[PDB]
Ligand binder design. Structure first.
Ligand SMILES: Nc1ncnc2c1ncn2[C@@H]1O[C@H](COP(=O)(O)OP(=O)(O)OP(=O)(O)O)[C@@H](O)[C@H]1O
Ligand SMILES: Nc1ncnc2c1ncn2[C@@H]1O[C@H](COP(=O)(O)OP(=O)(O)OP(=O)(O)O)[C@@H](O)[C@H]1O
Ligand SMILES: [Mg+2]
Ligand SMILES: [Mg+2]
Lengths: 523, 489, 46, 166, 363
């Protein structure tokens, strides 16, 4: 930061807030600008101006190095709003809301106070953003430029789903042109430093750092950084939006930002509102989530897909902050605690989840497959021993929704199509994961020399973009799809399920259980 | 004439949030006066202030319509010589405006004949109208239990994601498109994408013919806007509606979404003005602001304004001061409940908590009134019985109580309807039920002539004919299943 | 029982918060009305 | 030449000739995407000719970038671009685009995709050139003679408990 | 360092809040001051700077009673934050917030001291991978295994052998991992502190004539809220010394973590800050963050904290337990019914939980 002149001295320090007194002549400080407090002869501490009093005392919100801020220290004014580095030189790095790089154990600038696109600067979402989960991609379409909320209780996969969604883009980005590559900005707000390290290692393992940047504001950090982190993150994401590219900014999580802002407001002695929150807590998130949009073709067509996360208490979705966020986003992915603890993960409560604008962006193939799945699931919920066709397919679908890692588009859609057309009717519910693993990774037809298809094989990952083009029901890819599905089902029922139904030895039962555990965790 | 304070020079004395105090050497201009900041300040957009209080004979407290970033003390400010004025007339039709009345659609200049201030006095007693009519919306619940009145004030109360916006869009499609008069859509603190969707829908349906004659005006101050603009966009839109009503004697439709954000913005600015908060934390002048705003939304002897307003209920707390104060300012009240929505019933109207002013035999037909009253009584008794049912069970009821329960369940299912705008979410073609058809169907259902029809036949359908067709299809499916089971022997 | 217990917990928390906010609002109103008078001290002696 | 408009009715640029020339002088096809991004930002949406030029650049370029990417795939990029122009722009690919895709399929040696591309071209276009079909058949026969028609690990027999889930 | 021995004078005394005026400028916040005037006091008085009122006046919180304290009383800065003795000489001894041996067992004879307030480990110091902490107990090791650097929520009050489990953990961690333990009594009954000390001396975990494997840091209820809000940090600093200098897997017991929150809330209330919802201090999240974040597994060693959690009014959604659960990595629930059935340790296996129960971490 470039200093211009002294504008006063530090007078009082009440936690994370401070007040300055004017320098001789009252040079003046521009409102909402960044000021530097000379804590040492060579080091400075960032501060944000929030109040210009008549007497000449400036209200400051300390950002970093609060422990080294003392009354009487000189304060210099930069004269400009907060700007942070943005571009391709920040991808793969861990930064803080002030733009400083965070060391990790082995030159464009962006304004963090920019307005959102206006009414005629937007367009309907038309490009899907795949999350890699069958439930979300089918029943909860997410289009690029959409704000999708992720609500749920503590320890229910709220962070895991978003991290997997970021990871799911690695394979796609490496194949298609760089213009369509989806970049990610994971913003951690008030989380634990160990959790940030684990997330960083997980992203690095899958090579997602080339297309991802992490902004961290741990719980030990003051409220200013936590309150400012999401704005800096979206600012980093808006760089690609204004240049015809797409981003996937993620906020983990807005609840802690609200707590930090409430702390700041109460330290300033402002009228508390509902649940002691400030009156403008809604505006806090409004000015944030509004900046994520899908630009119109005239502006380039860039996008910023927001995935705000919110934590509820006892599955209470009538909280002040939860309802406020639900009133801003374009949907919600509710993660029920009962499903999660019951072994049904990611535990997406499809009944309460919804996508208000993502329906159009859904791909034609996924849209075609997902149309009937909606009715099947709706009937299955109402029906829950007479087992009709809807009940069998509903049970198989619920079994298939169990995932740990994001699934490639071709594998997920092929498995969903096979289940929808009744190819898993004879397959027992407990063997659905093993059946899917054999379908995706192995190839029974080739193994037993009974393959007739010319090109349609699951080992040909190149077919994903051909399936995405027309449909799974096109006359080009329909006959071979049906042939391979029939052969796989026949071979499975003949060889694998028949033997699995004839296991009584205790050792063999343990081996079968271990096999099922392994399959359930790997496709 | 020219104001005696136009061009008056003042200097910024204090800046706190969106509240700025300006000192005038020659005297503070009148309250509500619009001021412009002349200093460049390196800003990207101009800055405008509205006077809301007088601190002394020289200092005045103002609210900024744009962000106050890069605003220094002693910054020069010049009075505009009057309140904030917005364009009026037919030149505004088909255009998109903001709080200040600037066209934001990136099209040619408005070229309005004149402008009028956003702040105006409400109509007096002698100017009130005495006309009562029925506005057919095509929705069974509204047309039956809480019928809307032409030229009246309507409100939709609901939580987050309950269906307020969907009902507004359905009403727009079913009324505004086939409306003789003009329409004004005032977006207050709502999603900006919704404004774009509404604009595209209007253009596609030729409601806004940029190459021809349009019949709608869009005024939008959205969530991203600062609290200053969200407390005056409603005033500007209502000023345009008032001009259409009075200066032309034209029937107008005023769709406000959401009116709660107006009170919220007023509370936010009041917190900075240095006022003692009322209960919950709203400004002490909550009732007065709503009274001044709503009293202007009325039908006079010159024209008519049918206003539909969406009221947001924070945390689903219907007792909150903001929504609570709005009830007294509405002719028709539509209360939406989250629990009803979670049960698959859309719209989620809670008929027992809804009310209408034209629910009077002197206004609506006698048969309509009798059917509505019978339905309400049945629903009330069923709600009373549900308390016993949820504890002991249905089998612990009287013989006639079971009949009441079955009829009330069919009524609850029947009240649902698929909207033509929610086809994506419902996956079914929307229905438009005539007023007479609704009355006849509900009267028949009350008599009990449809006791044989399955309960689910009434779920997500239109009139009685749709119920019978769905029942026939269900009967055919059941017969097929029975034939398959019998052949299995 | 579970639903009523949840409502009971929520209601008690809201009541405590509302009462505390009311008391603090009254205290702030009392503090604001207070005005600092002229200081009768030897300002020159400094 | 004729006036063109976007969703909001605002006039849109149509002079795409300079951008095609810029695409023609790209060494790596990842630079072609940048040109398309610049076109979109400059309110000059690509047309059928621009997409054909981009496909030609993809076919004729050595690799995606100067440094190798983990999973470079020209076919994936071509299909993604075709899906874009078809679904998100409402432009039917002409015979030129499918011929470029088939040329890429036969050049890389992915004969199995050649069958699907040939069927697609026959269904949409009048027919596929015999030269590309002959080259694809030659690649398939060469693969079959060497026994490389399918990956080796797929042919291995594995019972119920002999499957390595890993 | 430059403010070592700086002179100041008491300017205001309102209960436990004392304002000190310094002619040369207030020392840095969180600085320990000593009241040189012990005219009639039976104990020394020490103040901690919490806020700066102006360039010369600073607000402080007293660690003892402020009785017999006059205005203009001389105060001398200690040169920095509160200092606590750290080393192998503190094993088997009882300390207070100020790091003074209250066991009347001779001088501590430490060789070094560390400040109470230390920044949490940086993101670069975090452990490469999660590791299990073998406690030696079949139930814990199997169903709810502990992780190095993790926080365990110990539910279930007295009557379920909670102290016995604590002593067993202290013994097992030293037996297997060779790491010491630090027990912090925050707002604890003095009688229960004496009982725990006697039990530890009886079980030889604190051997007066031999080698002890536990440090006791007690902040009792009768002490003012200024001490109950820093005893936990003193114990954490003692644990951090072993974690860093000696590179061990240390244990840190907190009894209770709710008392820490209550003490911080009271301290904030004294300063006049507006309480948040329910009535806890507005910095409730930050107060717990500045403490829990210091408990982690670094590249040198680790500190696994077993914190006894108390749920006020049996409301699991209360801000205190709700905020606390966001930092817990495991949960050990103790039930009286299990104890009455003759099962010891009285652990309800189906009520416990752990996050490392994942194949990616454990075998
Ligand atoms: N789909 C899944 N399959 C299996 N395990 C999962 C899945 N999703 C999450 N988990 C596991 O569940 C646990 C909790 O997940 P996660 O950390 O994402 O939750 P959270 O909502 O972020 O909770 P917190 O409040 O602690 O941040 C972790 O051990 C994680 O590995
Ligand atoms: N009549 C309806 N039929 C079917 N689904 C509906 C209907 N009304 C609402 N919904 C569902 O509820 C969702 C939210 O509806 P809507 O946009 O009207 O919310 P709202 O009341 O405006 O809330 P907020 O604006 O605060 O988010 C819709 O996306 C849709 O899934
Ligand atoms: Mg998480
Ligand atoms: Mg809405």
């Amino acid at each position: 930061f470039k200093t211009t002149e002294m504008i006063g001295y530090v007078h009082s320090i009440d936690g994370t807030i401070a007040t300055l007194i004017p320098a001789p002549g009252n040079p003046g400080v521009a409102y909402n600008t960044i000021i530097q407090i000379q804590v040492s002869p060579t080091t400075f501490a960032a501060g944000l101006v929030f109040n210009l009093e008549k007497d000449g005392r400036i209200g400051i919100i300390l950002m970093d190095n609060i422990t080294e801020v003392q009354s009487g220290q000189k304060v210099m004014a930069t004269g400009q709003l907060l700007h942070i580095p943005v571009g391709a030189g920040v991808l793969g790095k861990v930064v803080n809301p002030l733009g400083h790089e965070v060391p990790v154990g082995l030159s464009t600038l962006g304004k963090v106070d920019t307005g959102a696109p206006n009414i005629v600067s937007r367009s309907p979402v038309n490009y899907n953003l795949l999350t890699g989960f069958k439930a979300v991609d089918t029943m909860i379409p997410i289009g690029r430029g959409q704000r999708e909320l992720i609500v749920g209780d503590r320890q229910t996969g709220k962070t895991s789903i978003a991290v997997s969604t970021i990871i799911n883009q690695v394979r796609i980005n490496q194949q298609i042109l760089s213009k369509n590559a989806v970049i990610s900005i994971y913003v951690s707000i008030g989380q634990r430093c160990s959790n940030v390290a684990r997330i960083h290692r997980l992203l690095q393992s899958y090579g997602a750092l080339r297309y991802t940047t992490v902004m961290a504001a741990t719980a030990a950090e003051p409220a200013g950084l936590q309150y400012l982190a999401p704005y800096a993150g979206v600012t980093m994401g808006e760089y690609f939006m204004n240049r015809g590219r797409h981003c996937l900014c993620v906020y983990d999580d807005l609840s802690k930002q609200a707590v930090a802002y409430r702390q700041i407001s109460l330290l300033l002695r402002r009228p508390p509102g509902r649940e002691a929150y400030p009156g403008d807590v809604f505006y806090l998130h409004s000015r944030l989530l509004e900046r994520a949009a899908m630009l119109s073709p005239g502006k380039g067509g860039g996008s910023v897909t927001a995935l705000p996360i919110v934590e509820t208490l006892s599955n209470d979705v009538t909280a002040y902050i939860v309802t406020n966020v639900i009133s801003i986003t374009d949907g919600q992915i509710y993660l029920d605690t009962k499903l999660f603890t019951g072994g049904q993960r990611p535990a997406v409560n499809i009944g309460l989840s919804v996508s208000r604008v993502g329906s159009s962006a859904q791909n034609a193939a996924m849209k075609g497959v997902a149309g009937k799945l909606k009715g099947i699931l709706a009937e299955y919920r109402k029906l829950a021993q007479v087992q009709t066709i809807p009940m069998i397919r509903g049970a198989r679908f619920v079994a298939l929704f169990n995932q740990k890692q994001p699934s490639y588009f071709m594998n997920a859609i092929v498995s969903l199509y096979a289940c929808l057309n009744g190819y898993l009717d004879d397959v027992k519910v407990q063997y659905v994961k093993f059946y899917e693993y054999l379908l995706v990774h192995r190839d029974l037809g080739i193994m037993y020399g009974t393959a007739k298809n010319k090109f349609f094989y699951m080992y040909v990952q190149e077919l994903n973009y051909l399936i995405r083009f027309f449909t799974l029901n096109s006359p080009i890819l329909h006959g071979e799809l049906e042939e391979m599905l029939k052969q796989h089902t026949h071979l499975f029922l003949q060889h694998y399920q028949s033997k699995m139904n004839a296991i009584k030895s205790e050792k063999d039962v343990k081996a079968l259980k271990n096999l099922l555990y392994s399959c359930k965790r790997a496709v | 004439p020219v104001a005696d304070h136009k061009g008056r020079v003042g200097h910024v004395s204090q800046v706190i949030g969106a509240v700025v105090d300006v000192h005038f050497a020659d005297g503070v201009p009148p309250v509500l006066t619009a001021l412009d900041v002349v200093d460049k300040l390196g800003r990207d957009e101009p800055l405008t202030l509205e006077i809301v209080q007088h601190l002394d004979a020289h200092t005045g407290r103002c609210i900024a319509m744009q962000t106050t970033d890069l605003l220094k003390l002693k910054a020069k400010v010049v009075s505009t010589g009057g309140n904030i004025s917005v364009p009026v007339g037919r030149e505004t039709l088909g255009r998109i405006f903001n709080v200040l009345g600037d066209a934001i659609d990136q099209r040619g200049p408005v070229g309005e004949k004149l402008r009028m201030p956003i702040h105006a006095v409400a109509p007096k007693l002698a100017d009130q109208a005495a006309e009562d009519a029925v506005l057919t919306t095509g929705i069974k619940v509204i047309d039956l239990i809480l019928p809307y009145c032409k030229g009246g004030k309507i409100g939709l109360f609901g939580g987050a994601g309950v269906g307020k916006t969907v009902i507004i869009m359905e009403l727009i499609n079913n009324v505004a498109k086939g409306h003789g008069g003009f329409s004004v859509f005032a977006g207050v603190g709502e999603r900006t994408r919704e404004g774009t969707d509404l604009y595209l829908e209007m253009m596609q349906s030729k409601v806004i013919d940029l190459k021809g004659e349009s019949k709608c005006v869009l005024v939008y101050g959205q969530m991203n806007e600062p609290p200053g603009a969200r407390a005056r966009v409603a005033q500007s839109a209502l000023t345009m509606a008032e001009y259409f009503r009075d200066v032309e004697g034209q029937d107008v439709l005023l769709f406000i979404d959401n009116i709660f954000r107006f009170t919220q913005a007023n509370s936010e600015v009041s917190a900075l003005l240095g006022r003692i908060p009322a209960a919950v934390g709203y400004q002490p002048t909550l009732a007065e602001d709503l009274g001044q705003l709503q009293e202007r939304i009325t039908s006079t002897t010159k024209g008519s304004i049918t206003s539909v307003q969406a009221v947001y209920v924070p945390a689903d707390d219907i007792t909150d001061p903001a929504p609570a104060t709005t009830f007294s300012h509405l002719d028709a009240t539509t209360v939406l409940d989250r629990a009803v929505a979670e049960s698959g019933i859309y719209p989620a109207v809670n008929p027992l908590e809804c009310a209408s002013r034209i629910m009077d035999p002197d206004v609506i037909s006698v048969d309509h009134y009798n059917v509505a009253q019978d339905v309400v009584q049945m629903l009330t008794k069923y709600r009373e019985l549900q308390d016993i049912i949820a504890v002991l069970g249905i089998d612990e009821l009287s013989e006639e109580d079971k009949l009441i329960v079955d009829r009330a369940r069919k009524l609850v299912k029947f009240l649902s309807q698929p909207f033509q705008v929610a086809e994506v979410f419902t996956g079914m073609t929307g229905h438009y039920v005539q007023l007479d058809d609704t009355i006849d169907s509900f009267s028949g259902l009350l008599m009990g002539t449809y006791d044989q029809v399955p309960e689910m036949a009434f779920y997500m359908v239109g009139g009685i004919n749709s119920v019978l067709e769905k029942a026939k299809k269900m009967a055919e499916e059941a017969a097929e299943l029975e034939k398959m089971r019998r052949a299995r022997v | 029982q579970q639903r009523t217990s949840s409502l009971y917990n929520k209601t008690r928390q809201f009541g405590i918060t509302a009462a505390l906010i009311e008391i603090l609002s009254a205290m702030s109103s009392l503090e604001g009305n207070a005005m600092k008078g002229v200081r009768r001290n030897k300002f020159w002696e400094g | 030449a004729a006036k063109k408009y976007d969703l909001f009715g605002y006039e849109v640029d149509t002079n795409t000739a300079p951008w095609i020339e810029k695409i023609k002088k790209c060494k790596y096809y990842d630079e072609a995407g940048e040109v398309l991004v610049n076109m979109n930002v400059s309110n000059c949406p690509p047309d059928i000719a621009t997409y054909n030029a981009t496909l030609q650049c993809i076919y004729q370029s050595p690799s995606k970038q100067s440094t190798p990417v983990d999973n470079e795939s020209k076919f994936c990029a071509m299909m993604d671009l075709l899906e874009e122009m078809q679904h998100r722009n409402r432009l039917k690919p002409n015979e030129e685009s499918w011929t470029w895709v088939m040329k890429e399929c036969v050049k890389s040696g992915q004969f199995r995709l050649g069958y699907c591309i040939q069927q697609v071209m026959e269904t949409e276009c009048k027919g596929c050139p015999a030269d590309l079909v002959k080259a694809n058949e030659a690649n398939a026969q060469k693969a079959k003679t060497e026994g490389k028609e399918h990956p080796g690990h797929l042919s291995q027999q594995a019972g119920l408990f002999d499957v390595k889930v890993e």
